[PDB]
Amino acid sequence: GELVRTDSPNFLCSVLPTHWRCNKTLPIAFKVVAKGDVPDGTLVTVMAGNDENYSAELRNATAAMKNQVARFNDLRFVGRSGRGKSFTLTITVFTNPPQVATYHRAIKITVDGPREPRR
């Protein structure tokens, strides 16, 4: 369903808009997909930050794996990434031990989100 590679060889995730409004529901639900086998019920978590914001505030950043798919119901980014800057996503699959997959320049979050020029 249009997935993308993460920085880990074992996980892919759905496509995220390049620019979005803080606290606004995403255009397409976020999903983390495991390549290799991962036990149903396994918790998946999402975090975000960068040089301007070490830890962005997030909403509903927790999901559970089911048939290789962790589907986040209404993930939202509340913290902002800064003018021209994107967030680095850290996906964590709590297996034993925990597996982490990052995703650089994942998304830019501002107060307005994308807006047409003004005049």
Partner: protein, 131 residues
């Protein structure tokens, strides 16, 4: 594919791991919207449970940590190696590379230093099912 072939190479070459090897600044990302008091108690108690949330401030890379072999532990969560300080340690598979996180946090400031030192053991043995 839980890991990548160039496991030892990726950790010594790739810039992502490079910057996270030196003792750089780290910090507890939990409940930033709460009074400093409540954050302190939450961070220590959760530390006793063997888990926390730290990020390398400089780079903004966040990590969810679990201090366990692979409640609490011994050399995974140190609360006496220095009064007021807390040494932590937790393994994981970061971007297909077994590594171990080592660092400390000022039980009052809620920040400190940390880094990622390669994990020869887990990496090597991770080739068991990998082959």
């Amino acid at each position: 594919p839980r890991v990548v072939p160039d496991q030892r190479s990726k950790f010594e070459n790739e810039e992502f791991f490079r910057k996270l090897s030196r003792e750089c600044e780290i910090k507890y990302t939990g409940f930033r919207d709460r009074p400093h008091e409540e954050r302190q108690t939450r961070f220590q108690n959760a530390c006793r449970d063997g888990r926390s949330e730290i990020a390398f401030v400089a780079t903004g890379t966040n990590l969810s940590l679990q201090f366990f072999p692979a409640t609490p532990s011994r050399e995974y969560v140190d609360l006496e190696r220095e009064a007021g300080k807390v040494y932590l340690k937790a393994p994981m598979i970061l971007n297909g590379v077994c590594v171990i996180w080592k660092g400390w946090i000022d039980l009052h400031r809620l920040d400190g230093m940390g880094c990622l030192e390669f994990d020869e053991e887990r990496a090597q043995q991770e080739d068991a099912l990998a082959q």
